[PDB]
Every structure is written in structure tokens, then in C-alpha cells.
């Protein structure tokens, strides 16, 4: 593991695939701080696959995204999201703290693609 999130290993991996797909689709999403610190390390490793651009990279990236339409989320990668960071190395996202939320007092952040 890296950090658990109250989910079991299976529910956690599914939630991270969900979050990374949503982030690359919309490009800025409002979530909880502890999950924004975990999607940070899963989306940035997908844009590296998108910057390599092989066929083995499409297939090793297809096993972490979901199959949603927009293009597909795998075609938006390898296209626009990978074309704009062609000289930037690292730091493809940025997290912004918004404050606590009603009902939980859970620090809600916004995460987006820099």
C-alpha cells in the first residue's frame, strides 16, 4: 500500500481508477484532501504513458482508465492532454484547499491539471 482510505484494497483501486478518469475528463474536480493527495500520483503516471505514446503504452494505460465517452478517455489522453505537456517534466496537477464542508468537516480540495 501507500495510504489506505477506509476502503479495502479492491474498493480503493476502483475508486482511484474512477477519480483519475473523472479528472482527465473534466480537468478539475472537487474532492476530499486525502484522496486528492492520492490521485496526484496516479494521474501524473498516466500522462507519462501518454507522453511515451507507444502501443505498449496505450495497452498499459488502458488497464487503469475506465471506458467512458466524451472521444474515449483513452483517446483524450495521447491527444490533447499529452500534447500540451510535451516539454513540462513532472508537476502535471495542482491541488487547492477550499475549507471544511458542512456535515463532515472534511477539508474539501479542488484538483486540476496545471
Amino acid at each position: 500500500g501507500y495510504r489506505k482510505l477506509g476502503r479495502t484494497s479492491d474498493q480503493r483501486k476502483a475508486m482511484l481508477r474512477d477519480l483519475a478518469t473523472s479528472l482527465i475528463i473534466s480537468e478539475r474536480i472537487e474532492t476530499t484532501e486525502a484522496r486528492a493527495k492520492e490521485v496526484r500520483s496516479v494521474v501524473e503516471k498516466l500522462i507519462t504513458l501518454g507522453k511515451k505514446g507507444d502501443l505498449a503504452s496505450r495497452r498499459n494505460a488502458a488497464k487503469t482508465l475506465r471506458n467512458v465517452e466524451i472521444q474515449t478517455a483513452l483517446q483524450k489522453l495521447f491527444g490533447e492532454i499529452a500534447e500540451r505537456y510535451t516539454e513540462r517534466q513532472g508537476g502535471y496537477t495542482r491541488i487547492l484547499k477550499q475549507g471544511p464542508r458542512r456535515g463532515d468537516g472534511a477539508e474539501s480540495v479542488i484538483i486540476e491539471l496545471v
Binding site: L96, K97, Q98, G99
Partner: protein, 50 residues
């Protein structure tokens, strides 16, 4: 187990000595003019500019 004996309102008021909350730890945003939480965005009309 059960309390052997009633609790005075001296013992109770002593034990609630450290039961409190603290001031939210806030600054003043130099665009909104209003108050905000440090390292968070301006909840008023504004941004972070960090």
C-alpha cells in the same frame, strides 16, 4: 463499573477546563479585503494568488 458517588460541580467544572475550541487561525486576504483561512482560497469573491 458504576460511579461510586456523585460528582460535585467543582470537580466537573475543573475537568471541563481544557474542553474548548480555538480561534480559526485566519488572515486577511489582500484582494478581497475580507477575512480568510490561511493556505485556503478566499471564500469571498476572489482567489488564492499563492
Amino acid at each position: 463499573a458504576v460511579p461510586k458517588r456523585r460528582t460535585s460541580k467543582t470537580r466537573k467544572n475543573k475537568r471541563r477546563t481544557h474542553f474548548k475550541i480555538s480561534v480559526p487561525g485566519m488572515t486577511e486576504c489582500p484582494n478581497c479585503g475580507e477575512y480568510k483561512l490561511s493556505h485556503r482560497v478566499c471564500k469571498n469573491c476572489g482567489s488564492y494568488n499563492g
